[PDB]
Design a protein around this ligand. Structure first.
Ligand SMILES: CN[C@@H]1[C@H](O[C@H]2[C@H](O[C@H]3[C@@H](O)[C@@H](O)[C@@H](NC(=N)N)[C@@H](O)[C@@H]3NC(=N)N)O[C@@H](C)[C@]2(O)C=O)O[C@@H](CO)[C@H](O)[C@H]1O
Ligand SMILES: Nc1ncnc2c1ncn2[C@@H]1O[C@H](COP(=O)(O)OP(=O)(O)O)[C@@H](O)[C@H]1O
Length: 267
């Protein structure tokens, strides 16, 4: 299922006894922890190339993220090698730790969302993402582990149908308020400095591009709620506070649309 023999061949090609090992189209890490690679089969190479481009371009935008170390291709696919963003993935933070980071994350994400969207070479706009969802749902390829708990036992065709009639309205809201989004702004993709709890950088950038800011905020808030836990009241305060620091007035219906669409878009 995972082409370790092809991928390794790519990674080992420059020698130097690096001790590449799989850590998940797989992700590998060097023995010394200083480099990662993402590798994909032949069929997915354009998608990985577009990720490479996103990472390379973001390095010219003064937004903290990895550097592209190498791009390697062969008959059995491609690999994208990047520098480690050192620190602790935000999903691994305790509540207290995530509270230390919370205003720094709002600042960092605000900076990303302040890039001029019409200057971004990349897009993850809704017409693209909705089309992807139609495809995944047609292929019966939705992973229910990604859905909201209360949706996991509903057929994804039904779940797509709940969203389908809102696409026009949501496109009009996206036109009105487009930003450059991270594109998968779940807590594991925000690395924290383990001493100051400022943001060290962003990782997993293959969906970077124009979209409604809620394509990012929906994921960030939902995944932070895994940390904040049973505390419904702190979770709402936390989101209001985030919204005030970041500079947006919460639109819950729009946030929910993005939360409910995202899972349908993977596979
Ligand atoms: C599909 N993309 C990845 C995945 O995203 C998921 C992720 O899905 C989560 C929830 O929906 C929730 O019900 C959740 N709830 C449970 N009751 N167990 C999670 O288990 C779940 N995460 C997961 N399977 N890895 O949280 C959601 C906000 C998501 O972004 C939906 O697409 O999960 C992430 C981390 O969990 C990754 O960072 C992603 O890249
Ligand atoms: N360039 C990077 N820096 C730090 N961690 C990374 C990097 N690229 C990928 N990862 C890690 O590998 C996983 C999958 O991508 C992540 O959740 C994350 O910690």
């Amino acid at each position: 299922m995972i082409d370790l023999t092809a991928f390794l061949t790519l990674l080992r090609a420059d020698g130097g006894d690096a001790g590449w090992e799989p850590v998940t189209a797989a992700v590998f890490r060097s023995a010394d922890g200083s480099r990662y690679a993402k590798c994909v089969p032949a069929d997915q190479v354009a998608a990985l190339e577009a990720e490479r481009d996103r990472v390379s371009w973001l390095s010219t935008q003064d937004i903290p993220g990895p550097r592209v170390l190498d791009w390697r291709v062969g008959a059995a696919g491609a690999g994208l090698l990047t520098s480690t963003v050192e620190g602790i993935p935000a999903d691994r933070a305790s509540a207290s730790m995530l509270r230390a980071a919370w205003e720094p994350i709002a600042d960092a994400v605000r900076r990303l969302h302040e890039l001029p969207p019409e200057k971004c070479p990349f897009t993850r706009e809704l017409g693209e993402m909705f089309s992807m969802a139609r495809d995944v749902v047609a292929r019966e390829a939705v992973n229910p582990d990604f859905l909201p708990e209360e949706q996991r036992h509903t057929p994804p065709g039904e779940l797509l149908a709940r969203l389908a009639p809102y696409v026009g309205q949501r496109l009009a809201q996206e036109a009105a308020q487009t930003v450059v989004c991270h594109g998968d702004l779940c807590l594991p993709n925000i690395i924290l400095d383990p001493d100051t709890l400022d943001v060290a950088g962003f990782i997993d950038l293959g969906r970077l591009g124009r979209a409604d800011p809620y394509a990012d905020l929906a994921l960030l808030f939902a995944t932070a709620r895994e940390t904040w836990g049973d505390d419904e009241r702190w979770s709402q305060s936390a989101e209001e506070e985030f919204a005030a620091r970041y500079g947006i007035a919460l639109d819950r219906d729009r946030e929910r649309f993005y939360l409910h669409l995202d899972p349908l878009t993977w596979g």
